[PDB]
Amino acid sequence: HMRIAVIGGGSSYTPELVKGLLDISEDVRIDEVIFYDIDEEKQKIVVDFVKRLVKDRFKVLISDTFEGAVVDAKYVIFQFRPGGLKGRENDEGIPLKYGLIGQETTGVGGFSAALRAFPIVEEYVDTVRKTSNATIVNFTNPSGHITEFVRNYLEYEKFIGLCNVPINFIREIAEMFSARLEDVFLKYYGLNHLSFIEKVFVKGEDVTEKVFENLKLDEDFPTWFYDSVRLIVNPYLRYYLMEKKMFKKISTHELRAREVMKIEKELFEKYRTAVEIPEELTGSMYSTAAAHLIRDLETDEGKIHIVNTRNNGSIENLPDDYVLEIPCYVRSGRVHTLSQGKGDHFALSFIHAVKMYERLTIEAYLKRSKKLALKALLSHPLGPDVEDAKDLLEEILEANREYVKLG
Amino acid sequence: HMRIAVIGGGSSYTPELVKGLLDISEDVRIDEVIFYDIDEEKQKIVVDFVKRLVKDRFKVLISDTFEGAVVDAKYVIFQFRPGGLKGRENDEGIPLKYGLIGQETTGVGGFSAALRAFPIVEEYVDTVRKTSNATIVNFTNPSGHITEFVRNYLEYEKFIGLCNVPINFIREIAEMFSARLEDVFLKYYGLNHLSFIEKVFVKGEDVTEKVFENLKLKLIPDEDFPTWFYDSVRLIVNPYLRYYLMEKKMFKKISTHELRAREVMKIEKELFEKYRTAVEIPEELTSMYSTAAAHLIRDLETDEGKIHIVNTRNNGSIENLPDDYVLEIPCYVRSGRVHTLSQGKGDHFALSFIHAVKMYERLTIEAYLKRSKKLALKALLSHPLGPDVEDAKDLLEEILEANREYVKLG
Amino acid sequence: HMRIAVIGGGSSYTPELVKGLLDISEDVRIDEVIFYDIDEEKQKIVVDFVKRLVKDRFKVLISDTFEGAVVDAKYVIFQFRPGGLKGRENDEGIPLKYGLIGQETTGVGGFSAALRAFPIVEEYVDTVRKTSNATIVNFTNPSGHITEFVRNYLEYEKFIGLCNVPINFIREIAEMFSARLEDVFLKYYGLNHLSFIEKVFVKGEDVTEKVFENLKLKLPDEDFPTWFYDSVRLIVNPYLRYYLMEKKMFKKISTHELRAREVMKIEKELFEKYRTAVEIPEELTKRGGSMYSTAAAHLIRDLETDEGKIHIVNTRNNGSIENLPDDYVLEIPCYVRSGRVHTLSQGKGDHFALSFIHAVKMYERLTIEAYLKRSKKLALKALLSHPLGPDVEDAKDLLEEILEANREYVKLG
Amino acid sequence: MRIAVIGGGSSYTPELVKGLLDISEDVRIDEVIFYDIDEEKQKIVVDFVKRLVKDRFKVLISDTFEGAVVDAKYVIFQFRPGGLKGRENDEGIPLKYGLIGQETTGVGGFSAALRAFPIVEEYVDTVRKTSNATIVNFTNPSGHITEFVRNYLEYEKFIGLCNVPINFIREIAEMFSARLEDVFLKYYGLNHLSFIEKVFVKGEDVTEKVFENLKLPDEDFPTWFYDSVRLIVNPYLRYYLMEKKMFKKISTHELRAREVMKIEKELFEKYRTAVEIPEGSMYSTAAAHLIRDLETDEGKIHIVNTRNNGSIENLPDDYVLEIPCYVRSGRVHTLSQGKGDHFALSFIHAVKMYERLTIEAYLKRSKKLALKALLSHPLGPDVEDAKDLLEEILEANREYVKLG
Ligand SMILES: NC(=O)c1ccc[n+]([C@@H]2O[C@H](COP(=O)([O-])OP(=O)(O)OC[C@H]3O[C@@H](n4cnc5c(N)ncnc54)[C@H](O)[C@@H]3O)[C@@H](O)[C@H]2O)c1
Ligand SMILES: NC(=O)c1ccc[n+]([C@@H]2O[C@H](COP(=O)([O-])OP(=O)(O)OC[C@H]3O[C@@H](n4cnc5c(N)ncnc54)[C@H](O)[C@@H]3O)[C@@H](O)[C@H]2O)c1
Ligand SMILES: O=P(O)(O)OC[C@H]1O[C@@H](O)[C@H](O)[C@@H](O)[C@@H]1O
Ligand SMILES: O=P(O)(O)OC[C@H]1O[C@@H](O)[C@H](O)[C@@H](O)[C@@H]1O
Ligand SMILES: [Mn+2]
Ligand SMILES: [Mn+2]
Ligand SMILES: [Mn+2]
Ligand SMILES: [Mn+2]
């Protein structure tokens, strides 16, 4: 008997998650999927749509409580968004007036998002740990930072951080070369939204050169960049390496949050009567990453998945306990890190810097300290100068006063 | 186009290796297998037997030189025995006179086997390196020790040490639980002939406790580890550990019986005679290392990804041991590459043995590189099963006299 | 105001310690030295002798309790022997019948000595921690193993393990070259009673070769021959003999009186002399480990001032030997200044030395774990891991014997 | 015993020689030999030197670098590759891209390094194949040059010095009325990128009191910053932590190099006739004291640039760091300090990665890899400005560096 808990069932991505679950239900047994959400009305619409898609292939349940969802669960998926789109709007917009990048996961936006998430994830990991001891698969942002927090501070081992960029990238290369997903093997490492690809293999063949060539054929890295750095770079690195250009673009356009308010409102209307997943829905591929991971956690085949976990030797010149986004051998409930060699100095300058920042943030959270928050904020590469840091922090703390208090 | 070189064609294990290569030739392209040996008359009988088994499914060739074999080979299998069974006989026989364990791969006998191998493998790695840059798959003993030497001193990356105990153990477990070889997954670490298993998984299920229980029911019994030992140590232990943990008992056994090398001599000589006329592999042969080699080569060729226990650099597989120790450990093998997998921490009890003989392995290598009799004494004294200071000068002199043709130290 | 507690004040070595304390009392201020011992009658004799030597240069006190000795102390010196000479006699003699080395600190003898010391040191460190938080300076054996235990399990930072073989060696070298103690600088590392010297400097000059050459014209059958030093190229702690000359040491130990029994005779003779002596008796001066005293006093001295001096002590590696984990408690040279111990960089350790250090360190930690869990099964595992431990066929009976002999001090289940 | 001085014409040379005179009582110095590419400049300086020295040791000029370092036991690097005109370009060109322009920090330090590598490579090589002297380095950027020599040229006896550690200790000793050697620091970081966590004076932890006194204008760190961060920070961090404020300051004034040029020209003219030293000034006391303590068997603490080797436990052994070392008889021993703070580690890791990318770009003479190095510096260009910035730098340093 096998049950999957979904926390944040009201999410507009839920339907693609269920499609993934339906696709794997032929290979592994799923008796029930149970949904929990703080917003009951929004989840009911979604879950009614889900019921119509499942057609009784497994049971679809709603729990009124988080504990009721997770108590008999073998897997718990975190899909919730602390503070909601209103929080994300604050995250993106507040840093702008200081001349800083405002973005959901990167920089000061990621910092306030993290402060909102930590108390909720703390409460949730404790409950899971006192009951089912499930494996937790996390999408909640910021995903890598939360993983660092849970793995090295709460010390819950079966917490796996996921993101959609690895799977989107493998998908790209597969269609480029007309091969299957698992035919693609990468040298890949970094932090969630801060990742680097060094080698690309397809069916065993080294096609790195061909990937670089194809990337060529003005918000995008120019050609000379790839020739210089020789890494395929996470698109999110644009906020670092093209800061002035990104700032100008964010600050002269509607906040991204506000725009997804409109998209979400539209999808919910469609969900009332929809018989199949609406095109306007189709980070959509997060879903396939979750379901394939659960699938390969369930069997004894042994498969490669890029996930957020402790380095443990994946990258030889980084400390073992850094949570990284890296390729692992996944089999029967365990995740094994795979040897990759040395990481490039360019990549490591980013990885170290934000690893230090994100640990300063965690410490500041754990001690509920304004002083240490300032120290965390000054350390982020896209953080404030000294002259703006106090005002910025106060603004962040006031906006997040329902979620966290620092003294 | 794809060629495999076999170095030591005359081995009496050769037919098994070729059976293996025949089995994989359906999943993987093999155009030719070429054989080399220093003993042309021995090899000729073996290869003749081989030709009757192969039946032109691939091309079978003999080369007159090492270089002729390895040029244009993608894989090179070392299965030669430096100094022959007479060397083995000196390895086993000489320590005995000093009250020391005499054994092919363990202790002083392994020391002398190492010194015999190093000059040949140093020549062979050199030629491979300057021609084909083939992956070498090593069985030549002592295999883990030779691997340490090639990886960290000659610095040739594509050198993979193999051994027979991992495969035999997995095979045992699979039949215990009625499962396939690959259904079995181990937490396994240590040195060649000095390994430990901490966890056994069959089809995902942790069956470690059941493996311990069934070892209790296994059945000369007072020459194995008693029940309480498994209860105390909580490791499944390589049977070679008996030479360390039960030294007095094992010494008594070895020194009141025919030297093993002498039984082997007789076995090999009866096989050899059967090879002159056999149309199928005989039973006196059956032994299963030559399915570890074929499977490795196969999984090195495809893009499937498969687990193999092999001798290679730790690289984080055991987190509380240095990256550069060559260990016998599970690896993910795929498309020419061998990746170490996380296993967490090693047990303090296993680590005590691993560190000590690793240090002895490096001292022996260093004594060989400087060709130093002084440094050889130092290496000998460092082995847990080595001589006391009062016996060391004489033991070394006797070993160096016996290995005159193979080793020269100043 | 500055107080030193001496735990095990009844020890026959106390008079040499006090003499060291007297030598330093000119450089650093000592107001009082307070003594504690479980044996009150034996301590009274020794302390009456001490009072006569001190001549009111500082106060000499006795505390009837451990807590009363350490409560206001800045330094606490551990000088006690858990289980006494009777315990030591069991440690030396029990292993003999199994064909094993029986010795005060090395092998099976050190294992049972550790098992007796751990509960007492737990109790004592806890009391020091809850009161004065003094720096503890340790001679109680096995000193290196107890340091490993306190530093990495009890996690009490100001616990410094000492031994007398470093200072005895430095003294030899000074005399050999006519130089002062501090003019000697060593590359030195290992475990207590398990140490190795790679380089010797005198007044900045590398004199290693001269030391090796001199070691030979030191005329016998019981010590390393000349080819050994030429092969190994390390000056080795003399305790290494039990490892590298096992067969010869076993026969020596088994064919003479147990060492503890003959020390009972030496001690009983010293105590009679202590009743009336006005000066340190010679019989004490040339024996056992008499210069431990000078090690303790110079350490305390240099912990008190801000000069900065080198002392070989037992502490965490922390980069002294780049070849070993940082947390290994090692016996190594440290820059000692104002209450702190700073490890000094030394480069790589030799493979030969490392094989010993690794092996014994793993044994040490297995023993600690077995103690902490009060586990008979884990104690077996520890015993089988020692390079001088029993074979499988002997291990159970040998553990049983040890546990019965130490039943007043520890219980394992 | 002879000392070689590479850069004899430096306007700092009189101070170095004063220091060498102060130690010549505790240690034997037979001769100090000077070399410079600018013979006319050096001649005036060395003549002034000869009047100060008064034959207490022999003072010599050599016409070649080789002539100076042959049979020297110590060799002091105090030359400035490309001169004050180099520094002017280092300071001025970044400005045009909205970047901090400064002698040793950021893009200005990048071009200074590229200018120094060819010369030090040649010099280290000559020393190694002749006398095998200890080289004491002041040539900037000193920490970066030391990373280069220790880890790429792999010449062990090369010790990087800098001015800030001694200046700090001097402030502290005066604050508490103690000697220089009474002060002990938990000190770590890179050159011009350093942090103090603990201050001890005569064994007393006076860190708290150093914080309080620092509190007792708008161009330095405010009080809350020390309360937050709890590190005493090198003043150069302002270019990182207060970039906007520093950029506005540097970009609205004459370049620092111009001030220095006027100061040096005034001093040089004074040297023609001076009988005593007139009114980084005292790094030429860290050099003499280092050489002194390398010579005796006392053992003394000096903060210097060298391999970490476990001095900071959570940093790799091979990072060259500016850290306290036990100095005795030709050797430099690192001392245990425990762990480094995450905040200071973020800076150290980043600039260290940038340092190695820069050296790697130099060794392969690669324009491509230089762009990579430039992009990696926390104070480097955005992608949109990188190609032009690099071209401008390469154009300016035509005579010293050539990249393909
Ligand atoms: N890592 C990735 O590639 C990736 C991709 C997409 C989304 N995400 C993250 O997943 C989350 C999904 O958010 P979304 O885009 O659907 O926006 P959203 O705000 O609509 O969030 C989804 C649901 O979470 C619920 N929720 C909020 N807080 C909760 C809590 N404390 N407990 C239970 N439920 C709670 C809300 O009611 C909402 O229905 C966000 O954190 C988002 O950033 C991550
Ligand atoms: N590390 C070294 O180089 C070194 C050198 C000399 C002695 N030691 C050790 O120091 C200790 C001193 O022993 P010793 O040789 O003087 O002989 P000893 O056996 O006579 O013991 C010293 C005194 O300690 C007292 N004592 C025993 N247990 C005690 C306890 N639990 N609390 C307080 N006092 C206690 C006894 O009454 C005795 O008078 C021993 O452990 C010895 O091995 C170590
Ligand atoms: O702008 P949105 O529709 O909210 O999507 C934003 C999403 O972009 C993806 O690339 C990231 O991996 C997600 O973690 C992120 O949340
Ligand atoms: O037999 P003993 O007189 O008691 O001597 C035993 C002493 O020997 C010394 O070499 C050791 O360093 C001491 O730790 C030990 O206490
Ligand atoms: Mn993502
Ligand atoms: Mn009493
Ligand atoms: Mn009593
Ligand atoms: Mn001792």
Side-chain angles (χ1 to χ4, degrees), chain D residues 167-182:
Chain D
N167 279 318
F168 195 84
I169 293 178
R170 192 168 352 140
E171 262 157 283
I172 295 305
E174 286 167 51
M175 190 169 134
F176 291 90
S177 32
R179 292 218 199 121
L180 261 7
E181 50 200 5
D182 287 348

PDB file of all heavy atoms in Angstrom, chain D residues 167-182:
ATOM      1  N   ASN D 167      50.992  48.215  10.477  1.00  0.00           N
ATOM      2  CA  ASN D 167      50.265  49.436  10.802  1.00  0.00           C
ATOM      3  C   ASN D 167      49.159  49.169  11.804  1.00  0.00           C
ATOM      4  O   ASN D 167      49.047  49.902  12.789  1.00  0.00           O
ATOM      5  CB  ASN D 167      49.744  50.118   9.534  1.00  0.00           C
ATOM      6  CG  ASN D 167      50.829  50.961   8.841  1.00  0.00           C
ATOM      7  OD1 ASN D 167      51.599  51.673   9.499  1.00  0.00           O
ATOM      8  ND2 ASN D 167      50.895  50.873   7.520  1.00  0.00           N
ATOM      9  N   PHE D 168      48.378  48.103  11.597  1.00  0.00           N
ATOM     10  CA  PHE D 168      47.353  47.762  12.588  1.00  0.00           C
ATOM     11  C   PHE D 168      47.930  47.508  13.986  1.00  0.00           C
ATOM     12  O   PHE D 168      47.541  48.175  14.959  1.00  0.00           O
ATOM     13  CB  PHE D 168      46.401  46.638  12.147  1.00  0.00           C
ATOM     14  CG  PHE D 168      45.172  46.563  13.005  1.00  0.00           C
ATOM     15  CD1 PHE D 168      44.074  47.388  12.746  1.00  0.00           C
ATOM     16  CD2 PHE D 168      45.131  45.701  14.123  1.00  0.00           C
ATOM     17  CE1 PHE D 168      42.943  47.350  13.578  1.00  0.00           C
ATOM     18  CE2 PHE D 168      43.988  45.647  14.965  1.00  0.00           C
ATOM     19  CZ  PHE D 168      42.902  46.472  14.693  1.00  0.00           C
ATOM     20  N   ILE D 169      48.860  46.554  14.072  1.00  0.00           N
ATOM     21  CA  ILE D 169      49.559  46.227  15.325  1.00  0.00           C
ATOM     22  C   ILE D 169      50.132  47.487  15.984  1.00  0.00           C
ATOM     23  O   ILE D 169      49.988  47.707  17.205  1.00  0.00           O
ATOM     24  CB  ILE D 169      50.678  45.182  15.047  1.00  0.00           C
ATOM     25  CG1 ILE D 169      50.052  43.847  14.625  1.00  0.00           C
ATOM     26  CG2 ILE D 169      51.620  45.023  16.265  1.00  0.00           C
ATOM     27  CD1 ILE D 169      51.034  42.757  14.272  1.00  0.00           C
ATOM     28  N   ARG D 170      50.766  48.340  15.179  1.00  0.00           N
ATOM     29  CA  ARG D 170      51.281  49.606  15.724  1.00  0.00           C
ATOM     30  C   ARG D 170      50.197  50.489  16.375  1.00  0.00           C
ATOM     31  O   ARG D 170      50.423  51.055  17.463  1.00  0.00           O
ATOM     32  CB  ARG D 170      52.047  50.407  14.679  1.00  0.00           C
ATOM     33  CG  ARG D 170      52.842  51.574  15.307  1.00  0.00           C
ATOM     34  CD  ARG D 170      53.853  52.235  14.359  1.00  0.00           C
ATOM     35  NE  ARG D 170      53.975  51.477  13.102  1.00  0.00           N
ATOM     36  CZ  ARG D 170      54.075  52.037  11.904  1.00  0.00           C
ATOM     37  NH1 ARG D 170      54.078  53.374  11.801  1.00  0.00           N
ATOM     38  NH2 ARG D 170      54.180  51.262  10.817  1.00  0.00           N
ATOM     39  N   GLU D 171      49.039  50.618  15.714  1.00  0.00           N
ATOM     40  CA  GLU D 171      47.906  51.366  16.289  1.00  0.00           C
ATOM     41  C   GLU D 171      47.500  50.770  17.630  1.00  0.00           C
ATOM     42  O   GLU D 171      47.366  51.504  18.637  1.00  0.00           O
ATOM     43  CB  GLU D 171      46.696  51.377  15.350  1.00  0.00           C
ATOM     44  CG  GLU D 171      46.577  52.641  14.512  1.00  0.00           C
ATOM     45  CD  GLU D 171      45.762  52.422  13.239  1.00  0.00           C
ATOM     46  OE1 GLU D 171      46.301  51.826  12.267  1.00  0.00           O
ATOM     47  OE2 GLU D 171      44.567  52.837  13.213  1.00  0.00           O
ATOM     48  N   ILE D 172      47.340  49.435  17.635  1.00  0.00           N
ATOM     49  CA  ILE D 172      46.907  48.694  18.824  1.00  0.00           C
ATOM     50  C   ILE D 172      47.890  48.837  19.977  1.00  0.00           C
ATOM     51  O   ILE D 172      47.491  49.129  21.114  1.00  0.00           O
ATOM     52  CB  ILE D 172      46.658  47.201  18.487  1.00  0.00           C
ATOM     53  CG1 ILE D 172      45.478  47.065  17.503  1.00  0.00           C
ATOM     54  CG2 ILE D 172      46.416  46.392  19.771  1.00  0.00           C
ATOM     55  CD1 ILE D 172      44.149  47.753  18.033  1.00  0.00           C
ATOM     56  N   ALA D 173      49.173  48.643  19.697  1.00  0.00           N
ATOM     57  CA  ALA D 173      50.180  48.828  20.749  1.00  0.00           C
ATOM     58  C   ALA D 173      50.129  50.228  21.363  1.00  0.00           C
ATOM     59  O   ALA D 173      50.295  50.366  22.585  1.00  0.00           O
ATOM     60  CB  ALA D 173      51.582  48.539  20.233  1.00  0.00           C
ATOM     61  N   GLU D 174      49.920  51.268  20.538  1.00  0.00           N
ATOM     62  CA  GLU D 174      49.841  52.649  21.059  1.00  0.00           C
ATOM     63  C   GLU D 174      48.562  52.870  21.861  1.00  0.00           C
ATOM     64  O   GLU D 174      48.587  53.503  22.900  1.00  0.00           O
ATOM     65  CB  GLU D 174      49.883  53.674  19.932  1.00  0.00           C
ATOM     66  CG  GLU D 174      51.237  53.880  19.273  1.00  0.00           C
ATOM     67  CD  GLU D 174      51.095  54.668  17.985  1.00  0.00           C
ATOM     68  OE1 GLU D 174      50.457  55.749  18.027  1.00  0.00           O
ATOM     69  OE2 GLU D 174      51.588  54.206  16.922  1.00  0.00           O
ATOM     70  N   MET D 175      47.449  52.338  21.364  1.00  0.00           N
ATOM     71  CA  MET D 175      46.170  52.357  22.069  1.00  0.00           C
ATOM     72  C   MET D 175      46.279  51.804  23.492  1.00  0.00           C
ATOM     73  O   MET D 175      45.624  52.322  24.396  1.00  0.00           O
ATOM     74  CB  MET D 175      45.159  51.539  21.270  1.00  0.00           C
ATOM     75  CG  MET D 175      43.693  51.605  21.690  1.00  0.00           C
ATOM     76  SD  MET D 175      42.649  50.719  20.242  1.00  0.00           S
ATOM     77  CE  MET D 175      41.504  49.622  21.355  1.00  0.00           C
ATOM     78  N   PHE D 176      47.104  50.768  23.697  1.00  0.00           N
ATOM     79  CA  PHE D 176      47.216  50.096  25.008  1.00  0.00           C
ATOM     80  C   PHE D 176      48.539  50.306  25.723  1.00  0.00           C
ATOM     81  O   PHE D 176      48.721  49.835  26.853  1.00  0.00           O
ATOM     82  CB  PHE D 176      46.934  48.596  24.872  1.00  0.00           C
ATOM     83  CG  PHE D 176      45.511  48.302  24.544  1.00  0.00           C
ATOM     84  CD1 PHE D 176      45.102  48.225  23.224  1.00  0.00           C
ATOM     85  CD2 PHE D 176      44.565  48.154  25.565  1.00  0.00           C
ATOM     86  CE1 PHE D 176      43.781  47.975  22.930  1.00  0.00           C
ATOM     87  CE2 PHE D 176      43.238  47.903  25.271  1.00  0.00           C
ATOM     88  CZ  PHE D 176      42.842  47.822  23.952  1.00  0.00           C
ATOM     89  N   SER D 177      49.443  51.030  25.065  1.00  0.00           N
ATOM     90  CA  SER D 177      50.776  51.358  25.592  1.00  0.00           C
ATOM     91  C   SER D 177      51.568  50.100  25.909  1.00  0.00           C
ATOM     92  O   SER D 177      51.913  49.812  27.066  1.00  0.00           O
ATOM     93  CB  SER D 177      50.758  52.363  26.770  1.00  0.00           C
ATOM     94  OG  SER D 177      49.602  52.252  27.592  1.00  0.00           O
ATOM     95  N   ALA D 178      51.856  49.377  24.839  1.00  0.00           N
ATOM     96  CA  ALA D 178      52.508  48.083  24.876  1.00  0.00           C
ATOM     97  C   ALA D 178      53.497  48.008  23.710  1.00  0.00           C
ATOM     98  O   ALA D 178      53.507  48.877  22.836  1.00  0.00           O
ATOM     99  CB  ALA D 178      51.460  46.982  24.758  1.00  0.00           C
ATOM    100  N   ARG D 179      54.332  46.978  23.691  1.00  0.00           N
ATOM    101  CA  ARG D 179      55.238  46.772  22.561  1.00  0.00           C
ATOM    102  C   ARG D 179      54.538  46.093  21.373  1.00  0.00           C
ATOM    103  O   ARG D 179      53.469  45.493  21.514  1.00  0.00           O
ATOM    104  CB  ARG D 179      56.476  45.973  22.999  1.00  0.00           C
ATOM    105  CG  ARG D 179      57.427  46.722  23.960  1.00  0.00           C
ATOM    106  CD  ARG D 179      58.928  46.470  23.715  1.00  0.00           C
ATOM    107  NE  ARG D 179      59.740  46.814  24.891  1.00  0.00           N
ATOM    108  CZ  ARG D 179      60.534  45.961  25.559  1.00  0.00           C
ATOM    109  NH1 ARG D 179      60.650  44.692  25.179  1.00  0.00           N
ATOM    110  NH2 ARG D 179      61.214  46.379  26.620  1.00  0.00           N
ATOM    111  N   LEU D 180      55.144  46.214  20.198  1.00  0.00           N
ATOM    112  CA  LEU D 180      54.636  45.596  18.978  1.00  0.00           C
ATOM    113  C   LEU D 180      54.379  44.097  19.151  1.00  0.00           C
ATOM    114  O   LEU D 180      53.391  43.550  18.640  1.00  0.00           O
ATOM    115  CB  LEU D 180      55.617  45.830  17.824  1.00  0.00           C
ATOM    116  CG  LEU D 180      55.360  46.967  16.796  1.00  0.00           C
ATOM    117  CD1 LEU D 180      54.177  47.914  17.124  1.00  0.00           C
ATOM    118  CD2 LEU D 180      56.630  47.796  16.563  1.00  0.00           C
ATOM    119  N   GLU D 181      55.261  43.440  19.894  1.00  0.00           N
ATOM    120  CA  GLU D 181      55.207  41.992  20.015  1.00  0.00           C
ATOM    121  C   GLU D 181      54.301  41.514  21.143  1.00  0.00           C
ATOM    122  O   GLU D 181      53.999  40.317  21.222  1.00  0.00           O
ATOM    123  CB  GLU D 181      56.607  41.405  20.111  1.00  0.00           C
ATOM    124  CG  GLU D 181      57.483  42.083  21.146  1.00  0.00           C
ATOM    125  CD  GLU D 181      58.950  41.817  20.883  1.00  0.00           C
ATOM    126  OE1 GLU D 181      59.227  41.171  19.826  1.00  0.00           O
ATOM    127  OE2 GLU D 181      59.806  42.243  21.722  1.00  0.00           O
ATOM    128  N   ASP D 182      53.836  42.452  21.964  1.00  0.00           N
ATOM    129  CA  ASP D 182      52.794  42.184  22.944  1.00  0.00           C
ATOM    130  C   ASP D 182      51.404  41.952  22.331  1.00  0.00           C
ATOM    131  O   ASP D 182      50.496  41.477  23.024  1.00  0.00           O
ATOM    132  CB  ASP D 182      52.733  43.329  23.928  1.00  0.00           C
ATOM    133  CG  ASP D 182      53.904  43.330  24.884  1.00  0.00           C
ATOM    134  OD1 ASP D 182      54.645  42.316  24.932  1.00  0.00           O
ATOM    135  OD2 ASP D 182      54.149  44.300  25.638  1.00  0.00           O
TER     136      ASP D 182
END
